[PDB]
From Swiss-Prot, chains A, C, E, F, I, K:
Gene: INS
Naturally occurring in which organism (per UniProt): Homo sapiens (Human)
Domain of life per record: Eukaryota
Result of altering R22Q: In MODY10; reduces binding affinity to INSR; reduces biological activity; reduces folding properties
Name recorded for this polypeptide: Insulin B chain
Swiss-Prot record, chains B, D, G, H, J, L:
Superkingdom of the source species: Eukaryota
Gene responsible for this protein: INS
Residues in coiled coil: none
Protein name: Insulin A chain
Cysteine pairings via disulfide bonds: C6-C11
Residues of the full protein shown: 90 to 110 of 110
Length: 30, 21, 30, 21, 30, 30, 21, 21, 30, 21, 30, 21
C-alpha cells in the first residue's frame, strides 16, 4: 500500500475503508 | 496527532489501522 | 420534509460534517 | 446503534450529533 | 453543529446533507 | 456503452461536475 | 424529475446539463 | 456569496440551510 | 472482522486509496 | 472481474492491489 | 460542459462519471 | 500528463474521455 496525503473528509473516507465495520474513532487536535 | 499528520505530512494505511475499534 | 437514509461512507461523511473538530466515533457493531 | 438509527431507519443531523466526541 | 470550511464538491455534499430532499440551489459567483 | 444510475449524493456530485460555475438546482420533489 | 430521469432510470452527462443554471 | 464564503472563510450549516428549496 | 462491499464510485475511491501514484485500471466489463 | 470480486462479493484492501498499475 | 480543476480522489471521481462502465485507466506521473 | 494537468491547470471532460477503456 502507498503512503497518503489526507485532509478533511478525505481522511474519514480512508478510515472507513481501512476499518469498515470494526468502526473507528476520528480524533482531531483541539 | 493522526489527523494532523496525514494532512500536513503523509501517513500509511497501517498507521490509520491504529484508530479502528 | 422527512429525514434521509445515511449508510456506509455517506454516514461517516455526515458525521464529519456535524462533528468536525470535536471528532466522532463510528461504531456499527454497537 | 447508528446504523439502525441512521441507515436502516432515518435520522436527523441533530441525531448525528449523538456520536460526536 | 460546528463551522465549516468547504470548497468545490465538498460544499455540494454539505448542501445535500443539510437539505436532502427539499433540494437546494448551488449558486457560485460568476 | 449504456448510461449509469446516479442517486443522492452521487447525483449532486455529477451535477457539480457538469455545471460547475454555472451552478445548478437539485430538486427531487419535482 | 431528475431522480426519475437519472436515479430510477439512467441518464447521460448531457441530460444532466438540463439542471444547470 | 455562500459558495465563496464557505471556501475562503467559514460557514455554518444554518447559513447553508438558506439555500434549500 | 469480515470484508466490505465496494461498488461504483466507492470502489474507484478505494482503488485510488490503495494504488495512489502507482495508478490503476477500473474495468467493470472484465 | 473486480465488480464481481469486490461489489457483488466482498474483497480485502489486499485484493484491491490486484488492480494497481 | 465546463472546465475542471481536479486533484486527488476528485479526478478519479470525474473519470468514473465520464466513463462508467467502459472503465478507465488512472495513470499519474511517477 | 492528465492527472497533473487537471490539478495544476484545468482540463475538460472531453480530455478525460481519452482515458476511458
Ligand atoms: Ni454511495
Ligand atoms: Ni477534496
Amino acid at each position: 500500500f502507498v503512503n497518503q496525503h489526507l485532509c478533511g473528509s478525505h481522511l474519514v473516507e480512508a478510515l472507513y475503508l481501512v476499518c469498515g465495520e470494526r468502526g473507528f474513532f476520528y480524533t482531531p487536535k483541539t | 496527532g493522526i489527523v494532523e499528520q496525514c494532512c500536513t505530512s503523509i501517513c500509511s494505511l497501517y498507521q490509520l489501522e491504529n484508530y479502528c475499534n
